[PDB]
């Protein structure tokens, strides 16, 4: 039958809790110096910390280099004549000498280095070790991160000025922080899936400091790459993981990420049509093609349970002859696949949140989460189930969601959301 098949996607309370646990078991594993390397969930330190030394989350140093003119931007969070909250901004544009612009990468950066060093020096932000963003502009008439390190390294001096920051997620957090200074958890659930939170300084064994809180990039997409979920995968997810250009790698992702979501639905569908349950057992040369069933569709489906029109057209234009039932079948497939994808997500985000409650022992944790991504932004059902399944695993925690700003990504969304919050 069918109800039996899709049933394999179920994931009851217990099931989640286990995942939620096995995640935390991994977060510490990656956070622990003795194993931070061989770990599965990298849990990389971002240094977008906030400690008694003065370092604030909003603090940030962007670097836009494009053409013969590269300019830097400084951002540091303050208190104000009242103890409110402020965000000063400082711009400075350096020009690359001719004998340098037409030189070598080594030479080019040697310059950018000096300039930065100077710039920080002039603003007393030397050795502060702050987040470094990268933007690119292109003049029009009427890897860097590494090269920079080498240069900074060449200088022979203290290598404590900047620290790379390119993860789009971190910026999601930082971005939301400016709007809601209660945001301590960033998350990007779209083509792929990833998150970060504000860990306690005394937990990041890589960092020297111990007092205060610092954001941490989990890169949990790799979760389960060490069998941590082996007993939760299905035949479909397998066909996927075992057909991707990165077999065995990033499994947790290949479960939430709308990069394969559509594909799973296809397999799950192709599965049924094989055991004579769908389309009178006979798929189109189209439906029988990898990627042919785009995520884009799944969202169009769940977005409206009012009629089959949409389901009809997708399938119809897929080279099939849908039936009043055929549709309901497909619907059920999508909903099952998406919901599983949400629940698995709820698990982890929860572990992060729970673990964060345990930290600051207190009544109720009023925390905010910054989210961005195609899945979390174009899959109504997904979002709805995802919010609940989460709140229903985080006892005594007030979780408020806030999407990321409109029109921007990494070092960009940041520098912007801030240049704006500064104009005030
Ligand atoms: Na995005």
From Swiss-Prot:
Outcome when changing residue 194 to H: In MODY2; uncertain significance
Q: Please tell me the disease that this Swiss-Prot or TrEMBL record associates with the protein.
A: Maturity-onset diabetes of the young 2: A form of diabetes that is characterized by an autosomal dominant mode of inheritance, onset in childhood or early adulthood (usually before 25 years of age), a primary defect in insulin secretion and frequent insulin-independence at the beginning of the disease.
List the EC numbers from the record: 2.7.1.1
Please tell me where substrate binds in this chain. 137-138, 167-168, 194, 219, 253
Q: What protein family is recorded?
A: Belongs to the hexokinase family.
> Which UniProt keyword terms apply here?
Allosteric enzyme, ATP-binding, Cytoplasm, Diabetes mellitus, Disease variant, Glycolysis, Kinase, Mitochondrion, Nucleotide-binding, Nucleus, Transferase
InterPro entries tied to this protein: ATPase_NBD (IPR043129), Hexokinase (IPR001312), Hexokinase_BS (IPR019807), Hexokinase_C (IPR022673), Hexokinase_N (IPR022672)
Tell me the pathway. Answer: Carbohydrate metabolism; hexose metabolism; Carbohydrate degradation; glycolysis; D-glyceraldehyde 3-phosphate and glycerone phosphate from D-glucose: step 1/4
Name the reported effect of residue 228 to K: In MODY2; decreased glucokinase activity; decreased affinity for glucose; no effect on affinity for ATP
Q: Which reaction does it catalyse?
A: a D-hexose + ATP = a D-hexose 6-phosphate + ADP + H(+); D-fructose + ATP = D-fructose 6-phosphate + ADP + H(+); D-glucose + ATP = D-glucose 6-phosphate + ADP + H(+); D-mannose + ATP = D-mannose 6-phosphate + ADP + H(+)
**Where does the UniProt entry say this protein principally localizes?**
cytoplasm
Q: What is this protein called?
A: Hexokinase-4
């Amino acid at each position: 039958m069918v109800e039996q098949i899709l049933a394999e996607f179920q994931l009851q309370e217990e099931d989640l809790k286990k995942v939620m646990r096995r995640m935390q078991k991994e977060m510490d594993r990656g956070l622990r110096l003795e194993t931070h390397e061989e770990a599965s969930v990298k849990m990389l330190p971002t240094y977008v910390r906030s400690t008694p030394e003065g370092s604030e989350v909003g603090d940030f140093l962007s670097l836009d280099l494009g053409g013969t003119n590269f300019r830097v931007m400084l951002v540091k969070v303050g208190e104000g004549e009242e103890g409110q909250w402020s965000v000063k901004t400082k711009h400075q544009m350096y020009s690359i000498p001719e004998d340098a612009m037409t030189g070598t990468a080594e030479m080019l950066f040697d310059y950018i280095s000096e300039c930065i060093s100077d710039f920080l020096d002039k603003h007393q932000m030397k050795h502060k070790k702050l987040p470094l963003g990268f933007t690119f502009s292109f003049p029009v008439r009427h890897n860097v991160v590494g090269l920079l390190r080498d240069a900074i390294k060449r200088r022979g001096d203290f290598e404590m000025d900047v620290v790379a920051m390119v993860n789009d997620t971190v910026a999601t957090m930082i971005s939301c922080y400016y709007e809601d200074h209660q945001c301590e958890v960033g998350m990007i659930v779209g083509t792929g899936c990833n998150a970060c939170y504000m860990e306690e300084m005394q937990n990041v064994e890589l960092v020297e400091g111990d007092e205060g809180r610092m954001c941490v990039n989990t890169e949990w997409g790799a979760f389960g790459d060490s069998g941590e979920l082996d007993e939760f995968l299905l035949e479909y997810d397998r066909l996927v993981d075992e057909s991707s250009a990165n077999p065995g790698q990033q499994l947790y992702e290949k479960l939430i990420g709308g990069k394969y979501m559509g594909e799973l639905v296809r397999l799950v569908l192709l599965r049924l049509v094989d055991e004579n349950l769908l389309f009178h057992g006979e798929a189109s040369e189209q439906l029988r093609t990898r990627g042919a069933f785009e995520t884009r569709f799944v969202s169009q489906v769940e977005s409206d349970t009012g009629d089959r029109k949409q389901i009809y057209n997708i399938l119809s234009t897929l080279g099939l002859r849908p039936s009043t039932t055929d549709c309901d079948i497909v619907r059920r497939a999508c909903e099952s696949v998406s919901t599983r994808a949400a629940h698995m997500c709820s698990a982890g985000l929860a572990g992060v949140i729970n673990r964060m409650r345990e930290s600051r022992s207190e009544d109720v944790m009023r925390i905010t989460v910054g989210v961005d991504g195609s899945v979390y932004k174009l899959h109504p059902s997904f979002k709805e189930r995802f919010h609940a399944s989460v709140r229903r695993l985080t006892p005594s925690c007030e979780i408020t969601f806030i999407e990321s700003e409109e029109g921007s990504g990494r070092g960009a969304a940041l520098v912007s959301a801030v240049a704006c919050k500064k104009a005030c």
